[PDB]
Amino acid sequence: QDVDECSLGANPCEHAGKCINTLGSFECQCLQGYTGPRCEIDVNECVSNPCQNDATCLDQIGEFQCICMPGYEGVHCEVNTDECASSPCLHNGRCLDKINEFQCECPTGFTGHLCQ
Template sequence: MWLVLLATTLILIPFINCFHISNLCQNQCLNNGTCIINAEDKRESCLCSSAFSGDRCQIKINECSSSPCRHGGQCIDGLGEFMCSCLEGYEGRLCENPIDPCQNNPCENQGTCIRTQYNNNFRCVCPTNYSGRTCNIHIKDFCASSPCVLNATCENLPDGYRCYCPSNDSCDRTKIKNLT
Protein backbone atom coordinates (compact mmCIF):
# COMPACT_ATOMS: atom_id res chain seq x y z
CA MET A 1 0.00 0.00 0.00
CA TRP A 2 1.33 3.48 -0.86
CA LEU A 3 0.33 6.94 0.30
CA VAL A 4 0.61 9.66 -2.33
CA LEU A 5 1.15 13.28 -1.28
CA LEU A 6 0.74 15.95 -3.93
CA ALA A 7 2.90 19.00 -3.75
CA THR A 8 5.14 20.60 -6.31
CA THR A 9 6.73 17.18 -6.71
CA LEU A 10 5.31 13.70 -6.43
CA ILE A 11 6.29 11.84 -3.25
CA LEU A 12 5.56 8.17 -2.65
CA ILE A 13 5.59 7.01 0.97
CA PRO A 14 5.06 3.37 1.90
CA PHE A 15 1.92 2.95 4.04
CA ILE A 16 3.04 0.34 6.59
CA ASN A 17 1.38 -0.53 9.94
CA CYS A 18 -1.35 2.01 9.40
CA PHE A 19 -4.16 2.23 11.93
CA HIS A 20 -7.72 2.86 10.90
CA ILE A 21 -10.24 4.32 13.35
CA SER A 22 -13.62 2.79 12.82
CA ASN A 23 -17.01 2.33 14.41
CA LEU A 24 -17.28 -1.03 12.64
CA CYS A 25 -15.39 -2.92 15.33
CA GLN A 26 -17.01 -6.13 16.45
CA ASN A 27 -15.89 -5.66 20.07
CA GLN A 28 -17.07 -2.19 20.98
CA CYS A 29 -14.89 -0.20 23.35
CA LEU A 30 -16.43 0.90 26.64
CA ASN A 31 -16.32 4.25 28.45
CA ASN A 32 -15.85 6.36 25.30
CA GLY A 33 -12.82 4.37 24.18
CA THR A 34 -11.99 4.52 20.47
CA CYS A 35 -11.73 1.31 18.46
CA ILE A 36 -8.65 1.07 16.25
CA ILE A 37 -8.21 -1.58 13.53
CA ASN A 38 -4.69 -2.38 12.41
CA ALA A 39 -4.78 -2.10 8.61
CA GLU A 40 -2.15 -4.78 8.18
CA ASP A 41 -3.46 -7.61 10.36
CA LYS A 42 -7.04 -6.33 10.93
CA ARG A 43 -6.57 -6.71 14.69
CA GLU A 44 -8.84 -4.55 16.83
CA SER A 45 -7.73 -2.65 19.91
CA CYS A 46 -9.16 0.12 22.03
CA LEU A 47 -7.61 3.50 22.64
CA CYS A 48 -8.77 4.43 26.14
CA SER A 49 -9.14 7.83 27.75
CA SER A 50 -6.77 8.63 30.63
CA ALA A 51 -9.41 7.50 33.15
CA PHE A 52 -9.72 3.89 31.89
CA SER A 53 -7.59 0.90 30.89
CA GLY A 54 -8.05 -2.71 29.81
CA ASP A 55 -8.66 -4.41 26.45
CA ARG A 56 -12.06 -2.72 26.11
CA CYS A 57 -11.45 0.28 28.44
CA GLN A 58 -13.48 -1.52 31.09
CA ILE A 59 -11.20 -0.82 34.07
CA LYS A 60 -11.52 2.53 35.83
CA ILE A 61 -8.13 3.84 36.89
CA ASN A 62 -8.00 4.80 40.57
CA GLU A 63 -6.02 8.04 40.69
CA CYS A 64 -5.98 7.79 44.50
CA SER A 65 -4.12 4.46 44.58
CA SER A 66 -0.77 6.24 45.02
CA SER A 67 -2.12 8.22 48.04
CA PRO A 68 -1.21 11.63 46.59
CA CYS A 69 -2.76 13.73 49.38
CA ARG A 70 -0.41 14.78 52.17
CA HIS A 71 -0.81 15.57 55.88
CA GLY A 72 -3.81 13.25 56.30
CA GLY A 73 -5.82 14.74 53.42
CA GLN A 74 -8.54 12.51 51.93
CA CYS A 75 -8.26 11.65 48.23
CA ILE A 76 -11.47 11.81 46.18
CA ASP A 77 -11.20 9.83 42.93
CA GLY A 78 -12.65 11.27 39.73
CA LEU A 79 -12.57 10.45 36.02
CA GLY A 80 -8.96 10.95 35.01
CA GLU A 81 -8.33 13.21 37.99
CA PHE A 82 -8.49 13.40 41.77
CA MET A 83 -9.11 15.99 44.43
CA CYS A 84 -7.75 16.26 47.98
CA SER A 85 -9.94 17.25 50.91
CA CYS A 86 -7.48 18.74 53.40
CA LEU A 87 -7.54 18.53 57.17
CA GLU A 88 -7.90 21.79 59.07
CA GLY A 89 -4.64 23.71 58.96
CA TYR A 90 -3.56 22.65 55.45
CA GLU A 91 -4.28 23.80 51.91
CA GLY A 92 -3.04 23.26 48.35
CA ARG A 93 -3.83 20.77 45.60
CA LEU A 94 -2.14 17.98 47.61
CA CYS A 95 -2.68 19.52 51.10
CA GLU A 96 1.03 20.26 51.06
CA ASN A 97 0.90 23.81 52.44
CA PRO A 98 0.44 24.41 56.17
CA ILE A 99 -1.76 27.40 56.93
CA ASP A 100 -0.22 29.80 59.44
CA PRO A 101 -2.62 29.54 62.40
CA CYS A 102 -1.63 33.07 63.51
CA GLN A 103 -2.32 34.63 60.10
CA ASN A 104 -5.69 36.06 61.19
CA ASN A 105 -4.63 36.45 64.86
CA PRO A 106 -7.19 34.29 66.68
CA CYS A 107 -6.16 35.83 70.03
CA GLU A 108 -8.65 38.33 71.41
CA ASN A 109 -8.19 41.33 73.70
CA GLN A 110 -4.73 42.15 72.31
CA GLY A 111 -3.37 38.69 73.07
CA THR A 112 -0.24 37.60 71.18
CA CYS A 113 -0.47 34.55 68.91
CA ILE A 114 2.47 32.12 69.01
CA ARG A 115 2.66 29.33 66.43
CA THR A 116 3.51 25.96 67.99
CA GLN A 117 5.43 23.20 66.25
CA TYR A 118 2.95 20.53 67.27
CA ASN A 119 0.27 19.86 64.66
CA ASN A 120 0.50 23.34 63.11
CA ASN A 121 -1.29 24.85 66.09
CA PHE A 122 -1.06 28.04 68.16
CA ARG A 123 -1.25 29.35 71.69
CA CYS A 124 -2.13 32.81 72.94
CA VAL A 125 -0.15 34.86 75.43
CA CYS A 126 -2.90 36.80 77.16
CA PRO A 127 -2.65 40.28 78.64
CA THR A 128 -3.29 40.85 82.34
CA ASN A 129 -6.83 39.99 83.44
CA TYR A 130 -7.55 37.72 80.43
CA SER A 131 -7.30 33.96 80.01
CA GLY A 132 -8.63 31.14 77.85
CA ARG A 133 -7.38 29.56 74.64
CA THR A 134 -7.97 32.80 72.72
CA CYS A 135 -7.81 35.27 75.65
CA ASN A 136 -11.58 35.53 75.51
CA ILE A 137 -12.24 35.16 79.26
CA HIS A 138 -12.06 38.35 81.29
CA ILE A 139 -10.70 37.79 84.78
CA LYS A 140 -12.00 40.24 87.34
CA ASP A 141 -9.14 41.97 89.13
CA PHE A 142 -9.66 40.50 92.60
CA CYS A 143 -6.16 41.67 93.54
CA ALA A 144 -6.95 45.38 92.98
CA SER A 145 -7.95 45.78 96.63
CA SER A 146 -4.66 44.16 97.82
CA PRO A 147 -6.34 41.32 99.74
CA CYS A 148 -3.05 39.57 100.58
CA VAL A 149 -0.91 40.43 103.62
CA LEU A 150 2.22 42.52 103.32
CA ASN A 151 4.98 40.91 101.19
CA ALA A 152 2.54 38.37 99.68
CA THR A 153 1.94 38.30 95.93
CA CYS A 154 -1.65 38.21 94.68
CA GLU A 155 -2.63 36.15 91.60
CA ASN A 156 -6.03 36.60 89.94
CA LEU A 157 -7.94 33.43 89.17
CA PRO A 158 -11.17 33.13 87.12
CA ASP A 159 -13.30 32.98 90.28
CA GLY A 160 -11.09 34.43 93.03
CA TYR A 161 -7.45 35.00 93.89
CA ARG A 162 -4.41 33.25 95.35
CA CYS A 163 -1.84 34.73 97.72
CA TYR A 164 1.80 33.64 97.59
CA CYS A 165 4.13 34.43 100.46
CA PRO A 166 7.87 34.76 99.90
CA SER A 167 9.72 31.64 101.03
CA ASN A 168 11.46 33.46 103.87
CA ASP A 169 8.21 34.98 105.16
CA SER A 170 5.88 33.23 107.55
CA CYS A 171 2.58 34.68 106.31
CA ASP A 172 -0.27 32.19 106.25
CA ARG A 173 -2.25 33.49 103.26
CA THR A 174 -0.94 30.96 100.69
CA LYS A 175 -4.36 29.48 100.11
CA ILE A 176 -6.92 30.09 97.38
CA LYS A 177 -9.82 32.38 98.17
CA ASN A 178 -12.90 31.64 96.04
CA LEU A 179 -15.35 34.50 95.87
CA THR A 180 -18.18 32.76 94.08
Protein backbone atom coordinates (compact mmCIF):
# COMPACT_ATOMS: atom_id res chain seq x y z
CA GLN A 1 0.00 0.00 0.00
CA ASP A 2 0.92 3.66 0.21
CA VAL A 3 0.02 6.40 2.67
CA ASP A 4 0.22 10.17 2.35
CA GLU A 5 2.96 10.82 4.88
CA CYS A 6 2.74 14.36 3.56
CA SER A 7 -0.88 14.45 4.66
CA LEU A 8 -0.32 12.45 7.83
CA GLY A 9 1.78 14.46 10.26
CA ALA A 10 5.03 14.89 8.37
CA ASN A 11 4.93 17.98 6.19
CA PRO A 12 8.41 18.86 4.90
CA CYS A 13 7.16 21.54 2.55
CA GLU A 14 6.77 23.33 5.87
CA HIS A 15 4.87 26.49 5.01
CA ALA A 16 5.61 26.81 1.32
CA GLY A 17 5.65 23.85 -1.03
CA LYS A 18 3.65 21.01 -2.53
CA CYS A 19 3.01 17.80 -0.61
CA ILE A 20 2.10 14.70 -2.58
CA ASN A 21 1.83 11.01 -1.80
CA THR A 22 4.15 8.46 -3.35
CA LEU A 23 4.43 4.68 -3.32
CA GLY A 24 6.45 3.60 -0.30
CA SER A 25 7.44 7.20 0.33
CA PHE A 26 5.88 10.64 0.09
CA GLU A 27 6.71 13.34 -2.43
CA CYS A 28 6.81 17.08 -1.84
CA GLN A 29 7.60 19.80 -4.35
CA CYS A 30 9.80 22.78 -3.61
CA LEU A 31 8.54 26.35 -3.49
CA GLN A 32 10.67 28.74 -5.51
CA GLY A 33 14.05 28.03 -3.97
CA TYR A 34 13.62 25.27 -1.41
CA THR A 35 16.08 22.66 -0.21
CA GLY A 36 15.37 19.27 1.31
CA PRO A 37 16.62 15.80 0.34
CA ARG A 38 13.87 15.37 -2.22
CA CYS A 39 13.00 19.04 -2.50
CA GLU A 40 10.68 19.53 0.45
CA ILE A 41 12.79 21.65 2.77
CA ASP A 42 13.17 25.41 2.94
CA VAL A 43 16.73 26.71 3.04
CA ASN A 44 17.95 30.14 4.07
CA GLU A 45 19.27 31.73 0.91
CA CYS A 46 20.15 34.61 3.21
CA VAL A 47 23.03 32.43 4.35
CA SER A 48 24.80 32.41 1.01
CA ASN A 49 23.47 35.78 -0.09
CA PRO A 50 23.45 37.94 3.05
CA CYS A 51 24.36 40.81 0.76
CA GLN A 52 27.70 40.85 2.54
CA ASN A 53 28.14 42.63 5.85
CA ASP A 54 26.14 45.71 4.92
CA ALA A 55 22.61 44.41 4.57
CA THR A 56 20.10 42.72 6.84
CA CYS A 57 19.50 39.24 5.48
CA LEU A 58 15.85 38.24 5.62
CA ASP A 59 15.17 34.62 4.73
CA GLN A 60 11.76 34.35 3.12
CA ILE A 61 9.66 31.78 1.29
CA GLY A 62 11.87 30.42 -1.46
CA GLU A 63 13.21 33.96 -1.49
CA PHE A 64 15.22 36.43 0.56
CA GLN A 65 15.73 40.17 0.88
CA CYS A 66 18.68 42.18 2.13
CA ILE A 67 18.05 45.70 3.39
CA CYS A 68 21.01 47.96 2.71
CA MET A 69 21.57 51.68 3.13
CA PRO A 70 19.93 54.29 0.90
CA GLY A 71 23.27 54.97 -0.76
CA TYR A 72 24.66 51.74 -2.17
CA GLU A 73 23.17 48.79 -4.01
CA GLY A 74 23.94 45.52 -5.75
CA VAL A 75 24.11 41.87 -4.75
CA HIS A 76 26.38 42.79 -1.86
CA CYS A 77 24.93 46.28 -1.59
CA GLU A 78 28.51 47.49 -1.72
CA VAL A 79 28.45 49.07 -5.16
CA ASN A 80 28.24 52.85 -4.95
CA THR A 81 25.49 53.37 -7.50
CA ASP A 82 26.04 52.55 -11.15
CA GLU A 83 28.41 54.31 -13.51
CA CYS A 84 27.88 52.39 -16.73
CA ALA A 85 25.61 55.19 -17.89
CA SER A 86 28.56 56.24 -20.01
CA SER A 87 28.70 52.87 -21.73
CA PRO A 88 25.55 51.30 -23.18
CA CYS A 89 27.39 48.74 -25.27
CA LEU A 90 24.01 47.80 -26.71
CA HIS A 91 23.09 44.34 -27.91
CA ASN A 92 24.19 42.02 -25.12
CA GLY A 93 26.80 44.38 -23.72
CA ARG A 94 26.26 44.07 -19.99
CA CYS A 95 27.93 46.60 -17.73
CA LEU A 96 29.13 45.31 -14.38
CA ASP A 97 28.54 47.33 -11.23
CA LYS A 98 31.97 47.57 -9.66
CA ILE A 99 33.08 49.65 -6.69
CA ASN A 100 35.24 51.85 -8.89
CA GLU A 101 33.92 51.71 -12.43
CA PHE A 102 31.81 49.72 -14.86
CA GLN A 103 32.70 46.56 -16.75
CA CYS A 104 31.11 46.18 -20.16
CA GLU A 105 30.96 42.41 -20.53
CA CYS A 106 29.15 40.14 -22.96
CA PRO A 107 26.38 38.01 -21.44
CA THR A 108 24.89 34.83 -22.87
CA GLY A 109 22.26 33.45 -20.52
CA PHE A 110 19.97 35.86 -22.33
CA THR A 111 21.39 36.33 -25.81
CA GLY A 112 20.49 33.47 -28.13
CA HIS A 113 23.03 34.11 -30.86
CA LEU A 114 26.63 33.47 -29.88
CA CYS A 115 28.19 36.66 -28.57
CA GLN A 116 31.77 36.81 -29.79
